[PDB]
């Protein structure tokens, strides 16, 4: 068959008559006596080919010499019976019928084309009211709706020159008669005539469809059916079940009902029925045809002989969470079985039973048993594989020589769920599996099954060996850190071997190398960890790939020496001279990879496993019941807190205290007593043993068998050892409010009935979320991998200098992520230099691998500008330089890789598992650095206090190298200690505010005059003497009263003279608006000075359990949703002002050196009357929407926001993800642009930047300038429906709405994509198949 490269459009009644090979004019299906298909029926034989391979129906032409002769009795043609599977018929409707998809889908194409409301067309399809057609010279325009009674007088008056039809045939005379060009030429005016936004918004919506119906070449009346096509009889079969009963589809009930109501409608018209009956047949026919195509948009015509609704045609295509085609493919040559351990393996093999190796590899065996000459034919060989003779095991062992098989677990989260392995035949029925590999699959060996596939061809075994082998995947792709970490039990063997006692057998002696220690411990003389002195010769590669031995006299034990006999050459000895827990072993493998490559790191990750398994058995690390030790003072620490809780009950019962402080004063004695019973426990395990040296006594770290499992990191934490010995914490009641009485019993002691019942809700709630965090996370990683589906590295370099600034994110008093973790493996957008300039240490753009990353820490570089994929210049893809390095490998990214899919999984591999005093008055710095503020308008007052002016004042703790380490902020009532540049000791209060006092600082002293703060107007008048006490709470415009809303409270403070004392820094006088929750104690009548409060602003901010985030925060942050309360912004930089108020919402204006922007009424604004702001600065306070950051502050301002707000949910839970994987998804979220100016486009349509950037590269490159745009940002659910393919958007989203709109506009597919290429069944354009697609695109445009 010829190569195909796919279209879609409406179909005319004269094309549907071309697919069909005959008309279907009877509803009968089969014969009921003999089962030969009756004639003219649905399952006909003259129409849809013959039933038996090469034979007529009667039996005259049975032979094969007759290969095309159609019979003369019944005109069946003697061909193969697979032709019963590609042919179609057609029913000839006796009256038209509106195709439901193009009538009832939400924007009705029949509707917005004719310009008639959908409620008024549904009234005409049901014969409920006429509609005028070509009114002519009368008082009736073209689309009036004459009701059933109005029409009577109309025909009484005019008999001709007036035509009003009714039903489905009237909607055809409206569509068929309308002129598309006289409609579109005219509406070019009306879009420019009307001066209105919503008027000229829907007007262009109808002027675009009219311009998409004349360009594609479809008439409009093709949306009204005239002949219906029927499916081939073998895609809707009537196969006979075994036993005498037939098992039909349910498309034979909906086709046998369209042919009855259509055959009765022909009898009723040649019989001349009254019109009241043939209206109940037209409206009854077209209800059966609209249940065929899409069943459910009506009464839901339930099946017969049952009670469940039938399955229409649009329900087979419509998604089951997957397309009908390949997005599901069950597969041959496969098996599945239980997995077990098998720790004797290498890293690149796996067990495989002889009972699955002989059935997976069957046809490979019939090739050897005939090539080797044992069997004669292929049927005679089919018996030898049944009897299992002694030779087939000799041929099965030879077929499995170098043939890798693909093991794959059930819920494949990331790309390491499918790996290849070289099989080795074992006996049994369980697939063995190497221990280091199960941590990647995430598999326990307690009933987990694992399917095993088989790559057949020759280019599919060189891929299961070079690409998907098990020794090629040692670094995970989410972050470069290793994924072959020795997991749980081989790390308790390494730990036990490399510890040290204080007096064991063979202590203080001197050895002569690792071959002398292993020969000394196995002989029974020296204990495995006794402090010895040996001689070890370690190498080191310092020259151009050489090693130089270096003998020394190390101080170690017999344990660390026996383990030195495993480590490869180029490693130091201080790598094994620790106590070697679990983090130190995955760092021993991370260094062994960078220094020696992959050959020694695969042959060393095994020997570390054979030594951890072997020396862990010699432990016998068995956990008894003397292990988990209850502390001596678990009773007095609880009784003390048991009486101390009565002294807060006795006070309350006598009414001294309320209920609110009664609770929190009891929850803080238990939760602080729970810590003293735990902290008194780990001080009993950790220092358990007290051994004797040669003389006196001494203590050490314990060998308690339940503490070693928690200290090595083998299994468990330290927050779980406190439930076996300590106290069992506080347990939260069902709604979330914490229980007052805590379970004070461990698991080494029992739990009574009343405590074990309370601890059940904490368990039943955990199992109800772990089943929901998966079904909710398997839907976030499916929308991500459908927007980033078609991104592919397709070039080596683009040449753009635009990157993003990479600095370490510093969270208040501590830095969260160093600069090495953020820039490691990324090209440099420009050359960086030392603290002294013109000292360019890193050259032009180079991959910042380890050496350039340590060289940046060797110096004191503070920031680099690296190139990100969000700003690359290539069309349809990203360059290999913009992306970066990080991979399972370490080199730069290879051209042809598919970076769109491996970035949607590393974001979706987590989330399945992680679904979720504090005074702070004085700014406490943990370090000693100079204070250096920037971007602030505030100077010191009289008493030595810089007046707080706004929320623009942050604290930068400049280090000793010209960098920063801390970031802070400045609130109202901000007291200060130092200036700028004056050093401060660690933890000195430089700028402070009270928790329950955020008072109104006094900027300038002077009078207080009453402007909108007289009694009654904005604040009532309350009494007190001159001490300055009151509770005068000045309410804001959202805490404002009902009637008094034409005033906004403020104190236009005048100086001692009464004039306007202006705050130096602007032109406004001192009018310090009393901030949120203000208590103006200083009534009019008190004259104060600087520093004295104008209103007390408390703040509770308690508990900290009033926050949002988790998994719902990461799906909503990607959808780009408006967060219910936008923080408005200043669009254009200028000066501020107000306007007329009390329009329901206030208003505002900004003046550039006319712009208007209105505001709500509740908004406690953050600007004065006169103010000078910059483009894209806050005006109010609230969560800034994601779009507002894009339109105003730029594009790099939205990428630095989407990244840090999503990394802030992962790093809170201990998940590692390199943030290249959150920019190759943001890059696919803002690939649509809307046009402003034009000269080549239509000046108002929403095009793709892939296209709006080729014109301007084409026009502006020529001798004409002749457009300008503005990036859009739409979530990953609306950013995938709007692709340029329609098989990549129909396979995922709502399918009815995408084939409907793609059909009207007559779209086309290059496919040019992965999800649209896997469906047709060809080589994807990314990976090994990328070479062939470039070789095929250049076969077009050549020859």
């Amino acid at each position: 068959t010829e190569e195909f490269d796919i279209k879609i459009a409406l179909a005319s009644p004269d094309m549907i008559r071309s697919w069909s090979f005959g008309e279907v004019k009877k509803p009968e299906t089969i014969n009921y006596r003999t089962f030969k298909p009756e004639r003219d029926g649905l399952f006909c034989a003259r129409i849809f080919g013959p039933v038996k391979d090469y034979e007529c129906l009667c039996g005259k032409y049975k032979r094969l010499k007759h290969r095309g002769v159609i019979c003369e009795k019944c005109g069946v043609e003697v061909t193969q019976t697979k032709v019963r599977r590609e042919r179609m018929g057609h029913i000839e409707l006796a009256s038209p019928t509106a195709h439901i998809w193009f009538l009832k889908s939400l924007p009705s194409r029949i509707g917005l084309l004719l310009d008639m409301p959908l409620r008024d067309i549904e009234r005409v399809l049901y014969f409920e009211s006429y509609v005028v057609i070509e009114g002519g010279m009368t008082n009736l325009e073209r689309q009036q709706i004459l009701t059933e009674e109005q029409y009577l007088d109309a025909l009484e008056e005019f008999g001709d020159e007036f035509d009003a039809k009714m039903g489905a045939e009237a909607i055809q005379a409206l569509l068929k008669s309308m002129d598309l060009e006289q409609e579109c030429e005219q509406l070019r005016e009306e879009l420019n005539e009307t001066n209105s936004e919503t008027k000229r918004k829907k007007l262009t919506k109808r002027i675009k469809l009219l311009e998409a119906f004349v360009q594609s070449g479809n008439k409009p009346e093709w949306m009204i059916l005239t002949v219906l096509p029927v499916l081939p009889p073998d895609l809707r079969p009537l196969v006979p079940l075994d036993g005498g009963r037939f098992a039909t589809s349910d498309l034979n009930d909906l086709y046998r009902r369209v042919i009855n109501r259509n055959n009765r409608l022909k009898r009723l018209l040649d019989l001349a029925a009254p019109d009241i009956i043939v209206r109940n047949e037209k409206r009854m026919l077209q209800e059966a045809v609209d249940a065929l195509l899409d069943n459910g948009r009506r009464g839901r015509a339930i099946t017969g002989s049952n009670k469940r609704p039938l399955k229409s045609l649009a329900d087979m295509i419509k998604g089951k969470q997957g397309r009908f085609r390949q997005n599901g493919k069950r597969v041959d040559y496969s098996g599945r079985s239980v997995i077990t351990v098998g720790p004797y393996l290498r890293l690149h093999q796996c067990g495989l039973p002889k009972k699955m190796a002989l059935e997976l590899f069957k046809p490979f065996i019939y090739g050897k048993l005939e090539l080797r000459g044992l069997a004669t034919t292929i049927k005679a060989a089919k018996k030898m594989v049944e009897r299992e003779e002694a030779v087939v095991w000799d041929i099965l062992d030879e077929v499995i020589r170098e043939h890798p098989v693909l093991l794959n677990r059930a819920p494949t989260l990331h790309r390491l769920g499918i790996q290849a392995f070289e099989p080795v035949l074992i006996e049994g029925k369980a697939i063995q599996l190497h221990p280091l590999v199960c941590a990647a699959y995430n598999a326990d060996f307690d009933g987990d099954q694992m399917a095993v596939h088989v790559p057949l061809t020759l280019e599919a075994q060189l891929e299961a060996r070079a690409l998907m082998m098990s020794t090629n995947n040692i670094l995970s792709p989410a972050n470069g850190e290793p994924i072959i970490v020795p997991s749980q039990d081989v790390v308790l063997g390494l730990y036990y071997m490399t510890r040290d006692c204080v007096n064991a057998k063979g202590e203080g002696m001197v050895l002569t190398g690792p071959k002398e220690a292993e020969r000394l411990y196995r002989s029974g003389l020296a204990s495995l960890h006794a402090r010895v002195k040996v001689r070890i010769t370690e190498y080191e590669k310092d020259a151009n790939g050489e090693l130089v031995a270096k003998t020394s006299l190390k101080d170690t034990t017999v344990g660390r020496a026996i383990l030195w006999m495993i480590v490869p050459k180029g490693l130091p000895y201080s790598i094994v001279n620790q106590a070697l827990g679990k983090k130190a072993i995955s760092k021993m493998l991370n260094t062994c990879y960078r220094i020696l490559g992959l050959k020694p790191t695969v042959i060393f990750a095994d020997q570390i496993m054979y030594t951890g398994f072997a020396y862990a058995a010699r432990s016998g690390a068995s956990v008894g019941i003397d292990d988990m030790v209850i502390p001596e003072k678990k009773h007095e620490i609880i009784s003390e807190a048991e009486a101390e809780v009565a002294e807060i009950q006795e006070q309350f019962q006598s009414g001294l205290v309320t209920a609110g402080e009664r609770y929190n004063k009891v929850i803080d004695i238990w939760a602080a007593a729970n810590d003293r019973v735990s902290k008194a426990m780990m001080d009993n395990l950790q220092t358990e043993t007290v051994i004797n040296r040669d003389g006196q006594e001494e203590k050490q770290v314990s060998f308690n068998s339940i503490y070693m499992m928690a200290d090595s990191g083998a299994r468990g934490s330290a927050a779980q050892i406190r439930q076996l010995a300590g106290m069992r914490g506080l347990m939260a009641k069902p709604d979330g409010s914490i229980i007052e009485t805590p379970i004070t019993a461990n698991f080494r002691e029992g739990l009574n009935v009343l405590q074990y019942f309370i601890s059940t809700h904490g368990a039943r709630k955990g199992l109800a979320d772990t089943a929901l965090k998966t079904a909710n996370s398997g839907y976030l990683t499916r929308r991500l991998v459908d927007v980033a589906q078609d991104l592919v590295v397709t070039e080596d370099d683009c040449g753009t200098h635009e990157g993003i600034m990479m600095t370490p994110v510093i969270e208040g008093g501590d830095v969260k992520e160093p600069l090495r973790d953020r820039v490691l493996g990324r090209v440099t957008a420009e050359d960086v230099l030392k603290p002294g300039t013109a000292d360019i240490l890193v050259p032009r753009n180079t991959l910042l691998h380890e050496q350039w990353c340590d060289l940046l820490e060797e110096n004191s570089v503070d920031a680099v500008k690296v190139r990100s994929v969000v700003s690359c210049d290539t069309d349809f893809g990203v360059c290999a330089h913009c992306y970066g390095r990080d991979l399972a490998r370490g080199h730069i990214i290879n051209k042809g890789e598919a970076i769109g899919v491996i970035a949607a999984q590393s974001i979706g591999e987590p989330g399945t598992q992680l679904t979720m005093a504090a005074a702070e008055s004085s700014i406490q710095v943990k370090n000693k650095g100079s204070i250096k503020l920037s971007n602030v308008k505030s100077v010191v007052n009289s008493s030595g206090k810089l007046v707080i002016t706004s929320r623009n004042t942050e604290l930068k703790l400049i280090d000793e190298f010209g960098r920063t380490k801390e970031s802070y902020k400045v609130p109202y009532g901000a007291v200060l200690a130092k200036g700028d540049g004056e050093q401060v000791a660690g933890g000195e209060t430089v700028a402070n505010w009270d928790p329950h006092t955020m008072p109104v600082i006094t900027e300038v002293s002077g009078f207080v005059r009453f402007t909108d703060m007289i009694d009654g107007q904005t604040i009532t008048r309350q009494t007190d003497e001159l001490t300055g006490l009151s509770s005068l709470v000045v309410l804001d415009s959202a805490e404002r009263t009902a009637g008094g809303k034409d005033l906004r409270p403020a104190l236009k403070i005048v100086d001692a003279q009464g004039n306007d004392v202006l705050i130096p820094g602007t032109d406004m006088p001192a009018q310090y608006f009393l901030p949120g929750k203000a208590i103006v104690q200083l009534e009019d009548g008190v004259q104060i000075s600087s520093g004295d409060t104008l209103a007390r602003i408390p703040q509770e901010s308690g508990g900290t359990k009033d926050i949002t985030g988790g998994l719902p925060r990461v799906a909503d942050l990607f959808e780009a949703r408006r967060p219910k309360e936008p923080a408005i912004l200043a669009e254009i930089s200028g000066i501020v002002s107000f306007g007329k108020e009390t329009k329901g919402k206030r208003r505002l204006v900004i003046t550039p050196v006319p712009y208007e922007e209105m505001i709500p009424k509740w908004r406690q604004l953050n600007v004065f009357e006169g103010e000078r702001v910059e483009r894209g600065d806050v005006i109010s306070d609230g969560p800034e929407a994601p779009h507002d950051i894009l339109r105003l502050r730029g594009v790099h301002a939205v990428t630095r926001y989407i990244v840090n707000e999503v990394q802030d949910v992962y790093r809170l839970q201990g998940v590692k993800i390199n943030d290249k994987h959150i920019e190759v998804i943001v890059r696919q979220m803002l690939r649509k642009a809307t046009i402003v100016n034009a000269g080549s486009s239509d000046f108002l349509e929403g095009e793709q930047v892939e296209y709006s950037r080729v014109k301007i590269a084409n026009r502006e490159l020529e001798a004409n300038g002749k457009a300008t745009y503005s990036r859009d940002l739409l979530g990953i659910t609306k950013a995938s429906l709007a692709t340029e393919s329609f098989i990549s958007a129909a396979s995922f989203q709502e399918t009815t709405r995408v084939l409907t709109e793609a059909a009207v506009a007559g779209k086309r597919d290059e496919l040019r994509g992965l999800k649209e290429n896997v469906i047709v069944g060809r080589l994807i354009p990314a990976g090994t198949g990328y070479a062939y697609h470039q070789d095929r695109m250049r076969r077009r445009a050549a020859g």
Partner: protein, 76 residues
């Protein structure tokens, strides 16, 4: 035998064309056009040639255009 193709990726530094250079060469052993073997299959022999430097994408083309000059001889 083979455990890692890290040697082969050194000569051909892509890993997406080493799978295409070795599938083309390994066909030739499989269909007996040619015999340059320690009881190995035809896909581990094709990787022990690339590992040694006797095969790449140019040595396969020029050895094919030297086939036509051979076929041109018998073409007469």
């Amino acid at each position: 035998a083979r455990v890692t193709v890290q040697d082969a990726v050194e000569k051909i530094g892509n890993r997406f064309d080493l799978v295409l250079v070795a599938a083309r060469r390994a066909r030739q052993m499989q269909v007996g056009g040619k015999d340059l073997e320690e009881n190995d299959k035809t896909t581990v022999i094709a990787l022990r040639e690339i590992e040694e430097g006797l095969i790449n994408n140019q040595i396969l083309d020029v050895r094919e255009r030297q086939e036509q000059q051979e076929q041109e001889a018998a073409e007469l």
